[PDB]
Structure 1
Amino acid sequence: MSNFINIHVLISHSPSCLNRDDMNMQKDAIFGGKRRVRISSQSLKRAMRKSGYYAQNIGESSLRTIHLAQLRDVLRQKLGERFDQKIIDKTLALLSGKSVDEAEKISADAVTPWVVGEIAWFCEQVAKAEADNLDDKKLLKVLKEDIAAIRVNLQQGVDIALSGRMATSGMMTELGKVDGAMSIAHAITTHQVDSDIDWFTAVDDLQEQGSAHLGTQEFSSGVFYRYANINLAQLQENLGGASREQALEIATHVVHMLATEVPGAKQRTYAAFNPADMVMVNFSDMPLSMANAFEKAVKAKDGFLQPSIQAFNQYWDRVANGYGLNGAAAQFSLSDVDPITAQVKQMPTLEQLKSWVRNNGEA
C-alpha cells in the first residue's frame, strides 16, 4: 500500500469565525443528524497557497484572475527584459483566446490560474513562430505531442499540480487541463455545535455615549477534523514525470500546512491561531477518510478533543482490522493518550512524522 497518502488532522479552535455564509453566518453542514461547523476546502486550499510557509518551502503560488488587461501589464513587467511585448501579447492571446488590445479593460471567461513560468515557456515556444512560420494550429498540434514538457514548468505552480485547473477558452483548453492530484474534504466539527452570537456596538466619539442599535457576529469554538489525500503518481505526472521522493517532499509540506495553517478570516478580532492536536498519516492503495468516526457526534467528557482522539483511534482500529489494511501508518499527538495498535508508529514530534513520510513510511 503505497500510492495514496492519507492525512488526518484533529485541530481544536478557540471562539472564532473561520468561514462565513452569504449572510455572514458560520458555514455549517449536517452530519449524523447533527449540526457541525464547516470550513470550506477551497478556503483551506487558498489559505495554503497564500501562506508564508508555502512561499518559503514550495515556491510562488499561481495568480488566478479574469483581468487580462492587468495581467498583460504584469507579464510585461516580469517578462519584458526577456521577450518583446508583441510576442507576450500573442502568447497571452493564444492561451486565453481573447485579444490583447493595449486597452483599459478586457476580461476572460472565468477565473484562471496563471503561472508565469509556463507563460515564459510559451513565449519561448511561440518565439518559434518568429522562425519558419508555423500556423498557430500547427504549433498547437506540435505542443500537443509533448504535454510533459509543459508540466515540467508546473513546478513553479504545484498548487495547480495539487488542485488542478480547467480552461474553457483559448489554447489552454487543450494544453492546460490538469486533473489531480490532491483530494481535500471540508473541515467539519466532530461534535454538535450551537453557535454563539457577538452583539457588538460602535461608539461614536462625537455623539456617544448614547443609544444605538446593535450588530451581530456569529462565532464558535470547536474540534475540527481535516482530511487530505495525495495521489503520488498523479503528482509526479503533473510535475512532468518528477521523482517520487520529490512528490513525497511536497506531500510533507502539505502535511505541515494542513497541521498548522488556519484561514485568516476574522483573525484580527478573534485570533484563533491554534496548532493541530493530532496528525496521522497513512499510505494506502485506496483513499480512506475517517469522517465516520464522528458520524455519531462526539459528546464532551473533558472537552471535545480527547473523546475525538479516542473515537478516531477506535474507528481506525475497527476499519483497519475489518478491511485488513497494512500501512505505513504513523500518528502524532500532543496529548498523553492510550492509542494503538502496532504498527501505527507514535511520533513524539511533527518533524519526525514528516521525516517518516519523506522516507516512504519505512522510517
Structure 2
Amino acid sequence: SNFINIHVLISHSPSCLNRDDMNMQKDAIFGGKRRVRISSQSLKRAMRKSGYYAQNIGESSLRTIHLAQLRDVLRQKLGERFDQKIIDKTLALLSGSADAVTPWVVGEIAWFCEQVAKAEADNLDDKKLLKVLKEDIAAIRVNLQQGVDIALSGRMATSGMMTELGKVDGAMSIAHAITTHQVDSDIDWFTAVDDLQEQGSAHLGTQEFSSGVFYRYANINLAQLQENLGGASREQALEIATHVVHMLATEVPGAKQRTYAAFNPADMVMVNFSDMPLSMANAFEKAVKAKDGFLQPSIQAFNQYWDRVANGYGLNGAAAQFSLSDVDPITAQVKQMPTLEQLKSWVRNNG
C-alpha cells in the first residue's frame, strides 16, 4: 500500500492546550455535540519543533542534498529548456551520479537558470548577479541542507522557494485533534495578589480549561516521501514513518503547560496500511458516554467501529495496535503490540 494511517487515543488531565483570540479553548461540533479541539497546526508544530524531531528528522542522514551528484539528471531535466552552459554555471555558482531528483530542487534550480540566462542576455555578471541573488542563494542553500524536514513536514513558513514546484506539501497530513466525547469546559476564577495592597487582590480573571480523551489522526504518503527525498527507498520512508508514529504518540503542545502540566502519553496507538487514507473519527460521531472514565469506552468504541466498518471500507491490509489497556481487543486481523517499540519495528519491516 502507499499510505500509512496513524490513529492515537490520548487522555489529558485538566488543561488548556490550544486557544483562540479570546483565550477560549478551541472546539468543534461533531455529531451535534461540542468537542474540545487541538488544531492541526498546533499539533504539527508541536511535532516539528520538538527535540526528538530535531534529532531524528532534523539531523537525518538524507538531510544534506549534494548539488554535485545531481548534475546529470538536472542536465537532462532542465536540458530541454536550458542548455548545459547555463545549467552547469548555475549549479557551480550555487554550490560555490544520482538516479532521480526532488521536484522542488529541479524547480528552484530552473528558476535560478532563468535568472542567469537573463543575466547573460542583458550583459552582466560578477558581484552584480551575486548581490541581486544573494538572499535567494542563501535561502536555497539552507533548504538544501534540510531535505528530510522539507520532505516530511513541507517547506517552512519563510522558505525562499520561488516556483510552483517549490510549494512543497508535507508528506504527513495531520487532522485536528477532537475529543471522543462531549465537553462542557470548566472555569478557573483566579486572583493575582499584590504584595503592596492591603485590601483585596490586584487582578482577577477567569481561565477556561478541561480534561479530555483526544483522538489524533495522521497519515503518511510514502510515495511522495520517497520522491521528495530524491527517490529514496520504501524502507527509509518506513523509518521516517516510525518517527512520525513516535511523535504523534508522545508529543503535546506547550500551550498553558507551565501551569496545567498535561504531560500525558498515548494510551493507544494503532497503525494500518491502505491505498486510501481514512480517519476513524466516525467511531466517535455518536459522542462516547463515560463508563468508569472516558478512556476505556473510547478505546472500546474505536475497536467496535473498526470491527464493523474496516472490511467494507477496504481497510484490509497490515494493521497493528500497541496498547496500555486490557479492553477487549479488535478483530484478530489486527496484530497486538505490547510495547510501542515493537509496533515501530513492525512498521519498519513493511508491516
Is the contact between residue 60 and residue 157 of structure 1 (CA under 8 Å) also seen in structure 2?
no
Is the contact between residue 111 and residue 163 of structure 2 (CA under 8 Å) also seen in structure 1?
no
Is the contact between residue 322 and residue 340 of structure 2 (CA under 8 Å) also seen in structure 1?
yes
What's the CA shift for 1:189?
0.2
What's the CA shift for 1:183?
1.4
What's the CA shift for 1:182?
1.3
Is the contact between residue 153 and residue 239 of structure 1 (CA under 8 Å) also seen in structure 2?
no
Relative distance call for 1:55 and 1:129 in structure 2 (3 A) is farther
> Secondary structure, in 3 states, of the residue corresponding to 1:265?
coil
Is the contact between residue 154 and residue 160 of structure 1 (CA under 8 Å) also seen in structure 2?
no
Distance (whole Å) between structure 2 residues aligned to residue 177 and residue 224 of structure 1:
31
What's the CA shift for 1:211?
4.6
Is the contact between residue 64 and residue 114 of structure 1 (CA under 8 Å) also seen in structure 2?
no
Relative distance call for 1:253 and 1:78 in structure 2 (3 A) is farther
Is the contact between residue 152 and residue 239 of structure 1 (CA under 8 Å) also seen in structure 2?
no
What's the CA shift for 1:176?
1.7
Relative distance call for 1:74 and 1:196 in structure 2 (3 A) is farther
Relative distance call for 1:166 and 1:47 in structure 2 (3 A) is closer
Report the equivalent of 2:201: 211
The one-character-per-residue Cα deviations of 1:164-219 (angstroms, maximum 9, x if unpaired) are 34999976124522134211100000000010111111111111452555201110
Relative distance call for 1:243 and 1:132 in structure 2 (3 A) is farther
Relative distance call for 1:15 and 1:157 in structure 2 (3 A) is farther
Relative distance call for 1:320 and 1:171 in structure 2 (3 A) is closer
Identity of aligned residues (%): 100
> Secondary structure, in 3 states, of the residue corresponding to 1:65?
coil
Distance (whole Å) between structure 2 residues aligned to residue 59 and residue 327 of structure 1:
31
Relative distance call for 1:222 and 1:128 in structure 2 (3 A) is same
Report the equivalent of 1:296: 286
> Secondary structure, in 3 states, of the residue corresponding to 1:10?
strand
> More displaced, 229-238 or 321-330?
321-330
Relative distance call for 1:346 and 1:73 in structure 2 (3 A) is closer
Relative distance call for 1:269 and 1:152 in structure 2 (3 A) is closer
Is the contact between residue 284 and residue 301 of structure 2 (CA under 8 Å) also seen in structure 1?
yes
What's the CA shift for 1:243?
1.2
Relative distance call for 1:210 and 1:177 in structure 2 (3 A) is closer
Structure 1: any 5+ residue segments left out of the alignment?
98-106
Is the contact between residue 298 and residue 307 of structure 1 (CA under 8 Å) also seen in structure 2?
yes
1:88 has 2:87 as partner = yes
What's the CA shift for 1:343?
2.2
**What are the residue-to-residue correspondences of 1:67-216 with 2, within 5 Å?**
156-165=146-155, 172-208=162-198, 210-211=200-201, 214-216=204-206
Is the contact between residue 186 and residue 208 of structure 2 (CA under 8 Å) also seen in structure 1?
yes
What's the CA shift for 1:161?
1.7
The one-character-per-residue Cα deviations of 1:259-279 (angstroms, maximum 9, x if unpaired) are 000000011100000000000
Is the contact between residue 180 and residue 238 of structure 1 (CA under 8 Å) also seen in structure 2?
no
> Secondary structure, in 3 states, of the residue corresponding to 1:18?
coil
Structure 2: any 5+ residue segments left out of the alignment?
none
Relative distance call for 1:355 and 1:141 in structure 2 (3 A) is farther
Relative distance call for 1:229 and 1:155 in structure 2 (3 A) is farther
Relative distance call for 1:139 and 1:229 in structure 2 (3 A) is farther
Relative distance call for 1:21 and 1:167 in structure 2 (3 A) is closer
TM-score (norm 1): 0.74
Is the contact between residue 225 and residue 237 of structure 2 (CA under 8 Å) also seen in structure 1?
yes
Distance (whole Å) between structure 2 residues aligned to residue 207 and residue 78 of structure 1:
74
TM-score (norm 2): 0.76
Report the equivalent of 1:9: 8
The one-character-per-residue Cα deviations of 1:107-137 (angstroms, maximum 9, x if unpaired) are 9999999999999998999899999989999
